[PDB]
Every structure is written in structure tokens, then in C-alpha cells.
């Protein structure tokens, strides 16, 4: 991988799957600059798969994405995959890559570690 | 004249606070708020307090313009230390010094 995140391989992969699911559930999250520099490249490729649409492209999405349900569909219950293949894909069906953007906030207290707001473009 | 504010017996070792104080010493006081507001260090908030108090002693109870104010003299002195213990191995014991500081800031108008 590009940069080990101070974690181990299984632990880091779990970290990144969780961050990617949370990003496409909340559409913007505040994290650390390196975690964001990695979640960037993960969710880019997930939404590429979503834009493809085919069934194999769905089962490949379904391995690097967690199982949360979006209760707040106003009584509707989407899974994260249904979200990613309807809403996120249909939204970004025009642009050729570059689906997020990171914004530095400043030094978190307790670490001094920079905080970023990674969100969907 | 020359207004001053003091914070006596703050719970930070004084030579960690002197780091931050060596930045605002001599700056236009309109800058020093933002400088202390933007830096990583931890002694910055408890100095922002003292600075804003010494600047609120200029408008009130004297009559000065708080744009005309440079940080003439900032500094930090030692307070009373709290001597604690830390058990090392094999029955040994090592003393700890939870030190304090007195943060003094003096803002002026140059008149």
C-alpha cells in the first residue's frame, strides 16, 4: 500500500472499509489528513464501480463496503450498496473522476494532528 | 500609561510557557490574539486569557485605544511546585515536580 497508517494489514483494511462506508453514508466526515488521503483513493474506486452498474461490479462493491442500514430514509431502509448505486452514482454520472475534496481544518487538540473535512464533490 | 494583567499559579511548567511568550513579545496586540489562537502549543489558551484581560484593562479603568497597543513586556516566573512521587522498580522512588508559573503581560500605548 501507499502509506501504512500505524496499523496492521487486517486492522488497516477494516479501518478503511469503515471510513469509506461512513463517508458514503454521511457524505462528509472529519478525519485525520492521512486517513483522508487514503479514504480518498478508496471511495473514488468504489464510485467508479457504482457508475459501471453491472452485477459483478455490484458484488465487487459488496466486499469493500460494510453493512449498515440508513434508517433516515423517512421510514425507508436503504443498505449502503443501494445508496451507492442509486443516489451517488446517478449524481456523479457526468464527471470523469475526482469525486471528493479534502479541506484542512487545523490542529486537533490532544494530538496537534491536522483535521480535514473529506466530502463528496 | 502601561496596563498589565497577571495569572498567578497556572499549572504549566514555566519553561514550556516561555516558548509561547517568546512569540508575542513586542507584537502589535491585534496580531498577538491571532498568533496565540493559531499555534499548536497548549500554553496558548491560558495566555490568550491573560492577554485579553490586560487589553480589557486598557479600555476599562484606564482610557486607552486598544489598536494602539503593543505587547511591551510579557514574561513568566516560577510559582510553587507540587512535589509528587513515581514508583520506579525494586523499591526505588523518583520525585516528580508538577511546577507552576506566573504569567505576566504588560501592554502599552507607547506614550
Amino acid at each position: 500500500g501507499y502509506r501504512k497508517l500505524g496499523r496492521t494489514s487486517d486492522q488497516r483494511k477494516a479501518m478503511l472499509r469503515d471510513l469509506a462506508t461512513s463517508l458514503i453514508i454521511s457524505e462528509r466526515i472529519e478525519t485525520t489528513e492521512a486517513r483522508a488521503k487514503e479514504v480518498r483513493s478508496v471511495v473514488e474506486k468504489l464510485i467508479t464501480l457504482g457508475k459501471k452498474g453491472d452485477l459483478a461490479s455490484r458484488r465487487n462493491a459488496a466486499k469493500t463496503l460494510r453493512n449498515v442500514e440508513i434508517l433516515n430514509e423517512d421510514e425507508t431502509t436503504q443498505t449502503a450498496l443501494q445508496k451507492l448505486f442509486g443516489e451517488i452514482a446517478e449524481r456523479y454520472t457526468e464527471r470523469q473522476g475526482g469525486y471528493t475534496r479534502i479541506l484542512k481544518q487545523g490542529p486537533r487538540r490532544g494530538d496537534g494532528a491536522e483535521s480535514v473535512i473529506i466530502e463528496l464533490v | 500609561m502601561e496596563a498589565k494583567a497577571v495569572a498567578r499559579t497556572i499549572r504549566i511548567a514555566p519553561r514550556k510557557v516561555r516558548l509561547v511568550l517568546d512569540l508575542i513579545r513586542g507584537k502589535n496586540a491585534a496580531e498577538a490574539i491571532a498568533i496565540l489562537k493559531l499555534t499548536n502549543k497548549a500554553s496558548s489558551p491560558v495566555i490568550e486569557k491573560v492577554l485579553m484581560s490586560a487589553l480589557a484593562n486598557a479600555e476599562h479603568n484606564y482610557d486607552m485605544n486598544t489598536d494602539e497597543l503593543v505587547v511591551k513586556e510579557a514574561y513568566a516566573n516560577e510559582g510553587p511546585t507540587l512535589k509528587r512521587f513515581r514508583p520506579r522498580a525494586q523499591g526505588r522512588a523518583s520525585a516528580i515536580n508538577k511546577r507552576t508559573s506566573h504569567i505576566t503581560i504588560v501592554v502599552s500605548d507607547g506614550k
Binding site: 479541506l103 484542512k104 481544518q105 487545523g106 473535512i117 | 516558548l19 509561547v20 517568546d22 512569540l23 496580531e31 491571532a34 498568533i35 489562537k37 493559531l38 499555534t39 502549543k41
Partner: protein, 50 residues
């Protein structure tokens, strides 16, 4: 190892020459007016405009 001889308080202050910390590298926000930290989002009021 142990120090063979205590450090004179001149040598202490010579060693502590470079222990200073640097400025934050800040700019004036063109919207907030107040100061921001370059390439960061204005804590005081609103957007980043970049």
C-alpha cells in the same frame, strides 16, 4: 552513562539556542477579515474559497 561534570549554565543556554518555536505561518482572511492559517478553513466565519 552518567554526566561526569555538571553542565554550566552557559552551555545550557547555548544548547537551547535552537529550541525556539516558529511562527504559525498565518494570513488575513479575505472574507472573515480576521486571521486564518494558510491553506486551512477560517475558524471564525465560513468558507475557504479555493
Amino acid at each position: 552513562a552518567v554526566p561526569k561534570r555538571r553542565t554550566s549554565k552557559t552551555r545550557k543556554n547555548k544548547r537551547r539556542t535552537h529550541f525556539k518555536i516558529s511562527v504559525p505561518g498565518m494570513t488575513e482572511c479575505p472574507n472573515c477579515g480576521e486571521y486564518k492559517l494558510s491553506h486551512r478553513v477560517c475558524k471564525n466565519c465560513g468558507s475557504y474559497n479555493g
